[PDB]
Amino acid sequence: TLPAYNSDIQQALKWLHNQAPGITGLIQRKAQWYDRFSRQFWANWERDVFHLKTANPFGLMVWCIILGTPSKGFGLYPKNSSWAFGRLRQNFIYSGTQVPPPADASPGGNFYGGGNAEILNLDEIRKVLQLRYVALISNGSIAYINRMLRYIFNDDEPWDEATGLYFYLMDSTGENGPVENLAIYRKDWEGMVLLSSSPRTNHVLTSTPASDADWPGVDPAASGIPVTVETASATAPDGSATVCKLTKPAGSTAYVSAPIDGPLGSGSTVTFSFFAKAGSTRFIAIQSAADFPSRADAVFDLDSGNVISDQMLDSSVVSARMIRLENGWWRCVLTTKTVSSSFRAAYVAPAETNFSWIDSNSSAAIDVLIWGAQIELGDTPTGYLETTGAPVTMTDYVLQNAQTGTVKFTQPLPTGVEAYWTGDWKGGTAAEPARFAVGNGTQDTFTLSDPAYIGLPTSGAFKLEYRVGPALNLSPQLINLMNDRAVGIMPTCAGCDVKVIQE
Amino acid sequence: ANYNYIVDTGVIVADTADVLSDVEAEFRAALGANINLAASTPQGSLVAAEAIARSSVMRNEARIANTINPNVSFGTFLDAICALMGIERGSDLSTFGYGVQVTGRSQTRISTGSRVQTPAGAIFTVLSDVTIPAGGVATIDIKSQEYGNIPLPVGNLIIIDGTIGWSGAKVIASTRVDPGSRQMSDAELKNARVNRLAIQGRNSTMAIKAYVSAVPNVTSVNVIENNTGAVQVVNGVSFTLPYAVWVCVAGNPDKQAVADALWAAHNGGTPWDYGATNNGVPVDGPNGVPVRDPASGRKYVVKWTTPIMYDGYVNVTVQQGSSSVAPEAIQNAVVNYAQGKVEGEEGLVVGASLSAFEVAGAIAREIPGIYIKLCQVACVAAGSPAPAPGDFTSEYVMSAFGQATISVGNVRVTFV
Amino acid sequence: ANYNYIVDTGVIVADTADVLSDVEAEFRAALGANINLAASTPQGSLVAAEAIARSSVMRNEARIANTINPNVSFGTFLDAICALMGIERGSDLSTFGYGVQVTGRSQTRISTGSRVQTPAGAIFTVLSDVTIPAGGVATIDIKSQEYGNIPLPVGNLIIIDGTIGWSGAKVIASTRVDPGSRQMSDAELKNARVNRLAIQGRNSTMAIKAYVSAVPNVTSVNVIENNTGAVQVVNGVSFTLPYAVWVCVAGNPDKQAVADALWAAHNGGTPWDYGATNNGVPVDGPNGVPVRDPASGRKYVVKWTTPIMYDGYVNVTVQQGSSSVAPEAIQNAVVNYAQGKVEGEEGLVVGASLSAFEVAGAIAREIPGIYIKLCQVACVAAGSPAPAPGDFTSEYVMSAFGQATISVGNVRVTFV
Amino acid sequence: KRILRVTFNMPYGPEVIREDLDVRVRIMKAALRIQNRATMEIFGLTTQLRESLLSQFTAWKHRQRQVGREDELMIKVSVEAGYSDQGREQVSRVFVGEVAIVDIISPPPDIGIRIQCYTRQIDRTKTIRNMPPANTTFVKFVEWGANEMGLNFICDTSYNDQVLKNPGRSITVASAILASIQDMYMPDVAAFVDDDILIVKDRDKVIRPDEVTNVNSFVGIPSWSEWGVEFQCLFEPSIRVAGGVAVESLMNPSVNGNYVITALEYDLASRDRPFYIKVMGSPAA
Amino acid sequence: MKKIPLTAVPNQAISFNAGSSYWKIRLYQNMDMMNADISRDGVIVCHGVRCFGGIPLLQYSRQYRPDYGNFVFDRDADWTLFGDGINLFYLDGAEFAEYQALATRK
């Protein structure tokens, strides 16, 4: 229960037998033999009991007896006994009366391994026996059988639709064909960015400042001059030389506040986005306001691509993220949720040290390049929209026909701007973005791409089927064996005909 | 000095023994190399004792390693294997009810009054019963043994009395109880493990068969899916609805209990079919027993059937070889095998087929060395006289519906 | 000498006194009847070795004899047995927080094992050596001393074992607090196994009943199965598919929650049918609700109906007794019974007929002494004018897909 | 460190008399009809304890009065003796019965009482409530007697399946039931009552064969007798009557063997030398 | 429910008349667990029953049938805490049936 047990055998061996050859030799040999044929035997036999690791074919057979599987169709015994064709297989045998050392062409070569019903790999035998246990204890439930198919044939690992792993069971419930939970993204210089069918608004007054008066500077210390916005000639991600520079001189603890209509609301997720390029400093600092002192803070490293700092002065922060864009550009996004209604403004500043704050002292004059601010509700950055003293409201698209999937855009897609979609449609889900349209600059109505595979319903009553094979490279012998009703390894309900087949 | 694992044919871990050489080789090169390990010497005797102890160790380890797979296990060891699949080992019953007694006047019938039925009943009276001057009372009864019993419906005989209490009788209102008997099933538990292998499962042929087999006094059961619904015939038994599970239960279980178990193994939305007239015997004609849905709502109906009873016969011709006299141990073997007592070969079940070669094999099981010559069998319906020697053949088809029963007197053996 | 310590009723384990005496007797028989089996002499050492062995094996066999029984297994054997059905014991990992901010000065070096502490205990040890840069702030990685989901709230951790130069530690919001796990006990594994057995020992209708009734806000449920082979009324609801299951859910639950439960309790193959017109409100549209199967990204569609809503009107002509009562009390008692808050009486669930005798029973139970003269009941469609006098009857019968509610305003109490 | 308790059962409750008071219990039990006896010499009684015990122990209220329908007519007392060392206990049960006699042995300055308790002194029963069987087997008459007396029974004999005509219709009280069961078939199979269990077994058979008591230490010497082996021993809380014993003597090597117990003589004194039990045993078959 | 008292010893054997039967349970420390050998009315019922908390000693039906009872450990068996902390309880037929019905839907 608790206070130890010996069982060491070598306990017999007093201090006297300290220089003995023979007594200690006998005791050590006896201990080794008892170890070999009790402890090692029981360890190997427990590994034999373990069905997940029944590599030992003898254990697979013990399980064929336990579950009651007909073992005629299994492929136990060691391999390398079939001649067939090829230098990797056996060869015929003759009358080597002299018994030469190479043992003529082979030590054997037989027809063992008759196909079209018999599986040879022992791993699939283990899978089959697990499936038969599932069939024995099955009550016909479909979520249960799907989860156990997952567990057996994928070791409980989620799979994508490029696999086409095991499928449903007796449940004559066809899936979809309407389209639901649809999302659309557009691919451009902003990369992978979604669009909203509902009116989304950017509340910042100006997204790209070219004048200092655009965003004022706030500095409680006021030790030095405030941050000054300066127009710069650098290729902005939109494809223009319209970026701006924020410069923090040495000894200055100022930050530029973007004028925003206030307040933004109580208990609403707030998203701040903007585009930055590495300059003199390697990183930038941003703050989302709230009631004093509940301001949320964040710092984005423009080079390493790490959001190394996000400070919660209260329950504000939810998420912070950086999206990579070509020419060394980064969209820094901060999503903040606070039950307060005091979201007043967003402050930006250059940072000297990797954890420098919005008002941290700067030892030098450091400049950074920013462009294209955006402040919205929700919790996800959206397509950048130009604002010049206006809280711009815009609606990306309207889905005119759900069944056919044709989608109407507010404006025609610019040339080179691709469109991806996700959701479920035509009895198939697209959990990954699937391209369906390339912008030509003149058309705005586009037809979606077919998602996953098989209409699905398999019309009928009290009878369905499986679907498997493009994923796991299951043997045709395996599929044929599972398709035999006599063996009865498949989870079945009486009064349902289920054929496995299906690749 | 080795553990031979029979990979698929015998599924047994077998010891190899021959450890004496290994043990004396250990004594060598440890005590030296010139040890005289011949017998009649101290070292030889003790090395022999060590070898014997190691052989016993190997035997015991092999047995305990083999007991995991069935067909080689035994009590409280095969029982764990059954309990893995939830095959309940089984429960007991010994109680009757609502008998009848006719007596004289103002008599107090005795506690545990012994009465014998013509099949050696030996039943005690449970309640302390005092009769009435009218001349009739009711007694509760319990069998002397825990074994499964079925008393005859008519009053038979008495043991313990007072010369006044005339006799005990049985009425239709008397209830019969259906008992098990320790584990009976010592090797037919091994036989029934393969059938009741989906007790814990529901909504399937195997699940239905297992769950209805778990009902007491279901000695056998047949369940046919008939899944390819176009009416037709599937694995025997002509059908009416396209797809319906057909259940034929043997034995004499409680109607309500077996119906409730059949309902619990509901299968879902597939109906019950037992039509085509002769296919089995209807339990309640049309519109079988209703039973109530545990998911409270509505009053459904569950329909199954009972097999057509058959009476089998056997004539054997033996030679009494090896000078080992055994005149009347043959029909005992035949009925023992038919009842399902033997291991690995389930006897006459609802789907069986009475075979001369099978019964000859059973006789060879229970007594070798007699040189069976002729083993004719044949069988007739539940009634009917003996089928005459002309009918006696080597095989009876015994279609999927219908069960044959072999009596001790129906089997006759002639010595040549 | 060694008896038969395996036998049939499990392994027999004798005491080490007995096995030592047995080995001693064997050695006396082997070497000599009067040999000194002292603990220090070589023969006694051999005896002690043969006694420690030949006992370790007995204990091992007795430890793993009936190990295939899941109800009494242990350790990795229980792990293997319970992994057959997908239940897997977890891993005893620890919280693995990353990016914890460190504040200090100059070039302070945080070494492995610094053992920071959260305010509520929970000592986290540093797992990566980090030197503070000239800014004074850096990031470290900490792991929990114990195992499991140790909470790591955002705040200033106190330092237990701090070097000279370390100022403090802060859990910024970018700290990636990865929770751990505390494995799973053998008893908990048996618990999960028996839970799974209870889940997979139910048929279609019982599974639907249990799973859907387990959902919050579900007051009652009516589950019906065709099981007849024809479109008809089985016992009160007119079906529309020959083989289907029709389910009506009362209460005001979450549609997605009940859809997930009913999908998990799907028997399968047997499709849901909405029934014919006015067989319960065919809510969720003609096409059922789609839910995503947790196992695979394939969804499944489910169909169920909300009950036909009915408004119940009650007229009572109770007579005041010696004690004073108010009509609000009568209405409260009636509405309590209707909602089913009273013990014993189920209430006015889906498919429960509205009986004036039942209403009078509730009134008599809650308000004794009050003499009831006339109790009358009536039922109308939802959102309809109150029925005129004379439409009220002595008892109202309800369909199998309707639910009637009595509000406080539908009770008309008259003091005669 | 002997631990001896005399536990009465009184309307107030159990008042346990411990081993600190000078107590002396002489119990004598046997495989006979006769009720096993226990003489109890208890000194050091206070006036209050004497009032609470001796006044309740009486032979009245059933002779010149009525006050009787069930138990509480006479006080039932049990005896729990054993050893105790290192904190562990060994208190078994050695006697259960009702007091019948009460006198005083030692006058002042040590007022010591001497009571006499007998097992099943509730012959003040209900004059046989349920009539005995008319014609029945021996085991069945034994079951009826056990049910009448309220005791659980252990019946193990080869005479059970023998019918009797009128088996005990002359019985007048419950105690006479044991007399009748002893009267019929008396060469070997003698029935008795050990504490709360009514035992009906052959005299050459052990009640619990798995409960043999290997005995190696004796006080004196295990000597012969005209029936079996007789020996005294220190109190072992595992030796009952009719039990199996596996005597392994040193002084007398011919008395070794397996014996069944017929008699028992407990002599337990907390504050005196005698703490022995004497066993009469006969060859066991 | 009848609480069978225990002694803080590795190996012991307790004999008692419980539930109209003569039980004898030998509890011994085996390796790192407790095992029990249970006999009823003299004949041996089971050997080497591995003792676990809440989980009945007599596991299969024919031993606790009919209404013979069963023995339950409130915690995992450990002789160091016997008598104080861990107890063994005996249930008769109806009570063991109720306990089984409770424990089969957990």
Helix (H, G, I), strand (E, B) or coil at E97: helix
The whole-angstrom separation of Cα A393 and Cα A204 is 11
What single-letter amino acid sits at A89? R
Of C298, B207, B244, the residue nearest A139 (C-alpha) = B207
Cβ–Cβ below 8 Å for D137 and B160: yes
Q: Which of residues 166-195 of C touch E (CB under 8 A)?
A: 186-187, 190-191, 194-195
Query: Strand D229-234 and strand D190-194: pairing?
Result: unpaired
Compute the half-sphere exposure of residue B57: CA atoms within 13 Å on the CB side of its CA.
30
Q: Which residues contact E91 (CB under 8 A, 6 or more apart)?
A: E1, E2, E69, E70, E71, E72, E99
Chain A contacts of B51, Cβ < 8 Å? none
Instruction: Label residue C275 left, alpha or beta by phi (over 0 means left) and psi (-120 to 50 means alpha).
Output: left
Q: Which of A343, A417, A332 is nearest to A373 (CA)?
A: A332
Answer yes or no: do E34 and A1 touch at CB < 8 A. yes
Q: How far is D35 from chain B (nearest CA, A)?
A: 28
Which backbone phi and psi does D2 adopt, to 5 degrees? -60, 140
Token representation of residue B58: 């190997």
Find where tokens 């440890």 sit.
B30
d(CA C176, CA C154): 11
| Cβ–Cβ under 8 Å, residues B263 and A489 | no
Does the bond joining D222 to the residue before it have cis omega, within 30 degrees of 0? Answer: no
CB A123 within 8 A of CB A478: no
A433 DSSP β-pair partners = none
User: How far is the C-alpha of C224 from the C-alpha of C273, rounded, in Å?
Assistant: 11
* Cα angle for residues C71, C76, C77 (degrees, 5° grid): 45
CA distances from residue A498 to A483, A489, A502 in whole angstroms, order as listed: 9, 12, 11
Dist. CA A261–CA A201, nearest whole Å: 12
- Residue B271: list chain C partners with CB under 8 A: 227-229, 243
Helix axes A57-67 and A40-49, enclosed angle (nearest 10)? 50
Which approach determined this entry?
cryo-EM
- CA A261/CA A250 separation, integer angstroms: 32
CB < 8 Å to B111, chain D: 133, 136, 140, 143-144
Structure tokens, A143: 């979520």
Residue C224 phi, psi (nearest 5): -135, 140
State how far the Cα of A26 lies from the Cα of C36, in Å rounded to an integer.
Answer: 19
Burial class (CB in 10 A: 0-12, 13-18, 19+), C371: exposed
Residue type, C402: G
Cα gap D280→D242, rounded to integer Å = 10
The minimal CB distance from D211 to the residues E7, E8, E15 is found for: E15
- Give me D82's structure tokens: 């054993």
Cross-chain residue pair A495–B225, CB shorter than 8 Å? yes
Spacing of C-alpha C338 from chain mean position: 29
- Rg of the Cα atoms in chain D: 20
Helix locations, D120-203, DSSP H: 138-149, 175-183
Residue type, A123: D
Tokens at B341, concatenated: 């007592």
Cβ-based neighbours of E59, under 8 Å, separated by 6 or more = B83, C69, C71, C72, E49
Give me the helices (H) in B309-355, please: 330-338
- Sequence-distant (≥ 6) Cβ neighbours of residue C385 within 8 angstroms: none
Using CB atoms, pick whichever of C50, C203, C243 lies closest to residue B202: C203
User: Rounded to an integer, what distance in angstroms lies between the CA atom of residue A342 and that of residue A292?
Assistant: 9
CA distances from A21 to A133, B31, B32 (A): 55, 7, 9
Q: What are phi and psi of A486, to 5 degrees?
A: -65, -40
Question: Neighbours of A (≥3 Cβ pairs closer than 8 A)?
Answer: B, C, E
| Chain E positions in Cβ-Cβ contact with residue C63 (cut-off 8 Å) | 30-31, 33, 35, 50
Query: What is the DSSP code (8-state) at residue C410?
Result: G
Kindly state whether D210 is in contact with chain E, defined as any CB-CB distance less than 8 angstroms.
yes
| Sign (positive or negative) of CA dihedral C96, C98, C101, C107 | positive
Q: Is the dihedral of CA B165, B171, B174, B177 positive or negative?
A: positive
Residue ranges of E strands in C71-165: 98-104, 109-110, 116-117, 123-126, 130-131, 137-144, 156-159
Torsion angle of alpha carbons B102, B108, B112, B118, nearest 10°?
A: -20
Contact status, residue A386 vs residue A394, Cβ threshold 8 Å: no
- Å from A249 to nearest chain C CA? 18
In sequence order, the 6+-apart residues with CB closer than 8 A to the CB of A22 are B30, B31, B32
Q: How many CB atoms lie within 10 A of CB A319?
A: 18
Residue of B262, B274, B147, B272 whose CA lies nearest to B215:
B262
- Taking phi over 0 as left and psi of -120 to 50 as alpha, with beta for the rest, A200 belongs to beta
The reply to whether residue C54 touches residue B53, judged by beta carbons under 8 angstroms, is yes
> Exposure of C267 by Cβ count < 10 A (0-12 exposed, 13-18 middle, 19+ buried)?
buried
State the Cα–Cα distance between residues B400 and B222, nearest whole angstrom.
8
CA angle at residue A394 from A389 to A396, to 5 degrees? 145
* Number of alpha carbons in the 13 Å side-chain half-sphere of residue A6: 14
Cβ neighbours for C17, distance < 8 A, ≥ 6 positions apart = none
Of A280, A273, A407, the residue nearest A346 (C-alpha) = A273
Name the helix (H) or strand (E) containing C17. helix C16-30
DSSP lists the bridge partners of residue D51 as none
Nearest to A279 by CA among A254, A253, A303: A303
Which three-class secondary structure string do you get for chain B?
Answer: CCEEECCCCCCCEEECCCHHHHHHHHHCCCCCCCCCCCCCCHHHHHHHHHHHHHHHHHHHHHHHHHCCCCCCCCCCCHHHHHHHCCCCCCCCCCCCECCEEECCCCCECCCCCEECCCCCCCEEECCCCECCCCCCECCCEEECCCCCCCCCCCCCCCCCCCCCCCEEECCCCCECCCCCCCCCCCCHHHHHHCCCCCCCCCCCHHHHHHHHHCCCCCCCEEEECCCCCCCCECCCCECCCCCCEEEEECCCCCHHHHHHHHHHCCCCCCCECCCCCCCCEECCCCCCCCCCCCCCCCCCCCCCEECCEEEEEEEEEECCHHHCCCCCCHHHHHHHHHCCCCCCCCCCCCCCCCEHHHHHHHHHHHCCCCCCCEEECCEEECCCCCCHHHHCCCECCCCCCCEEEEEEEEEEEEEC
Q: Which residue has the tokens 């390819």?
A: B228
Q: Does B228 touch chain D (CB under 8 A)?
A: no
For residue E66, whether the previous peptide bond is cis, meaning omega lies within 30 degrees of 0, is yes
Please calculate the CA angle B114-B117-B118 and round it to the nearest 5 degrees: 140
Closest CA to B223 of B282, B267, B177, B172: B267
Distance, CA of B225 to CA of A373 (rounded, Å): 69
Length in residues, chain B: 416
- The rounded distance, in Å, linking the Cα atoms of C365 and C360 is 8
CA-CA-CA-CA dihedral for B233, B236, B241, B247, to nearest 10 = -170
Within E41-95, strands assigned E span 43-50, 70-73, 88-91
| Chain centroid offset of residue C372 CA | 46
CB atoms < 10 A from the CB of D14, how many? 11
Closest CA to C342 of C370, C316, C367: C367
From the centroid of its chain, how far is CA C98?
Answer: 34
Tokens of D244: 């199996």
Dig out the tokens for B384 from the structure: 């009917």
Say which DSSP state B321 is in: G
**Taking CB atoms and an 8 Å limit, are B111 and D135 in contact across chains?**
no
Q: Do C187 and E44 touch (CB under 8 A)?
A: no
What DSSP element (H or E) covers B407? strand B403-415
Which of D89, D103, D98 lies closest to D42 in space, CA to CA?
D103
Buried b (16+ CB within 10 A) or exposed e, A283-314: bbbbbbbbeeebbbbbbbbbeeebbbbbbbee
Taking the C-alpha atoms of residue A76 and residue A58, their distance in angstroms, rounded to an integer, is 8
Q: Report helix, strand or coil for C85.
A: helix
The candidate with the shortest Cα–Cα distance to A66, out of C177, B150, B193, is B193
Q: Nearest CB to C76: which of A46, A147, A161?
A: A46
C-alpha span between C36 and C24 (Å, rounded) = 10
Q: Which residues of E touch D197 (CB under 8 A)?
A: 17
DSSP C33-48: TT----SSSHHHHHHH
> Which parts of chain D are beta strand (E)?
2-8, 16-17, 23-30, 37-42, 76-85, 88-89, 95-106, 112-118, 135-137, 152-156, 163-165, 190-194, 197-201, 219-224, 229-234, 244-245, 259-269, 275-283
Tokens of E38: 């249970």
Question: With contact defined as beta carbons under 8 Å apart, do B306 and B280 qualify?
Answer: yes
Number of CB pairs, chain A paired with chain E, less than 8 A apart: 15
Q: CA geometry: angle at B127 spanning B121 and B133, to 5°?
A: 100
Six-digit token string for B8: 């698929």
d(CA C200, CA C191): 14
- Closest B-chain CA to D164: B160
Residue-by-residue DSSP string for A228-256: EEEE--SEETTTEE--EEEEE-TT---EE
Rounded distance between C-alpha atoms, residue D52 and residue D42, angstroms = 14
Closest CA to B185 of A181, E60, C390, D215: E60
Can you say how many angstroms the Cα of residue C196 is from the centroid of all Cα atoms in its chain?
A: 11
Enumerate residues 6+ apart whose C-beta is below 8 A from C293. Answer: A142, A143, A146, A168, C263, C299, C300
- With an 8 Å Cβ cutoff, is E100 touching chain C? no
If phi > 0 it is left, if psi is from -120 to 50 it is alpha, else beta; for residue B313 that is beta
CB pair distance less than 8 Å for A29 and B267: no
| Burial class for C394, CB neighbours closer than 10 Å (0-12, 13-18, 19+) | exposed
Tell me, yes or no, if C264 comes closer than 8 A to chain A by beta carbon: yes
CB burial of A123-142 (b: ≥16 within 10 Å; e: otherwise) equals ebbbbbbbbbbbbbbbbbbb
Alpha helices in B28-77 (DSSP H): 42-66
Q: Determine, for residues B204 and A138 on separate chains, whether the beta-carbon distance falls below 8 Å.
A: yes
Note the residue count of chain C: 416
Residues 6+ apart with CB under 8 A from A43: none
- What letter represents residue B175's amino acid? T
Q: Decide if B106 touches D, using CB distance below 8 A.
A: no
Chain B residue with the nearest C-alpha to that of C236: B298
Q: Which two tokens stand for residue A119?
A: 């599986």
How many other CB atoms are found less than 10 A from the CB of residue B254? Answer: 16
**Token digits for D130?**
């349920």
Chain E residues with CB within 8 Å of chain A CB: 10, 29, 31-34, 77-80
For D152, the closest of E7, E17, E42 (CB atoms) is E17
Residues of chain E contacting residue D152, judged by C-beta atoms under 8 Å apart: 17, 20
Query: Tokens 């600059």 map to which residue?
Result: A441
Enumerate the β-bridge partners of residue D88. Answer: D85
User: Cα separation of B416 and B372, whole Å?
Assistant: 10
Test B112 with D140 for CB contact under 8 angstroms. Answer: yes
Chain C interface disruption, residue of A171, A322, A332, most C CBs within 10 A: A171
Write the Ramachandran bin of C193: left for phi over 0, alpha for psi from -120 to 50, otherwise beta: alpha
Angle (CA) C304 C308 C309, round 5°: 125
Place of tokens 């119990």: D27
Kind and range of the H or E element at E102? Answer: helix E93-103
Cβ B405 vs Cβ B310: under 8 Å: yes
Bridge partners, residue D233, by sequence: D277
Residues 313-332 of B with CB under 8 A from A: none
d(CA B220, CA B217): 9
DSSP sequence for D39-65: EEEE----HHHHHHHHTT--S-SSSSS
For the record, the structure tokens of D117 come out as 């308790």
Determine the Cα–Cα distance for residues C144 and C93; give it in Å rounded to an integer: 9
B379 - beta bridge partners? B312
- Cα(E53)–Cα(E56) distance, integer angstroms: 8
**How is residue D270 written in tokens?**
């907390």
Strand partners, C140: C100
Q: Which amino acid is at E32?
A: D
Residue C198, both tokens: 């209870």
Q: CA–CA separation, B18 vs B2, rounded Å?
A: 9
* Structural contact between residues A420 and A184, judged by C-beta atoms closer than 8 angstroms: yes
- CB of A60 closer than 8 Å to CB of A125: yes
Burial of E90 (0-12, 13-18, 19+ CB in 10 A): buried
What are residue A419's DSSP bridge partners? Answer: A186, A437
- For B78, the closest chain E residue by CA position comes to E60
B395 touches chain A (CB under 8 A): no
Residues of E in contact with A5 (CB under 8 A): 31-32
Nearest to B10 by CA among B75, B62, B88, B84: B62
Give the 3-state secondary structure of A162-228.
Answer: CCCCCCCCCCCCCCCCCCEEEEEEEECCCCCEEECCCCEEECECECCCCCCCCCCEECCCCCCCCCE
- Contact criterion met (CB below 8 Å) for B274 and B304: yes
Q: Determine contact, residues A379/A255, Cβ cutoff 8 Å.
A: no
Closest CA to B14 of B85, B49, B86, B65: B65
The SS3 call for residue D272 is: coil
Are chains D and E in touch, 3+ Cβ pairs below 8 Å? Answer: yes
Task: Specify the resolution in Å.
Answer: 3.3
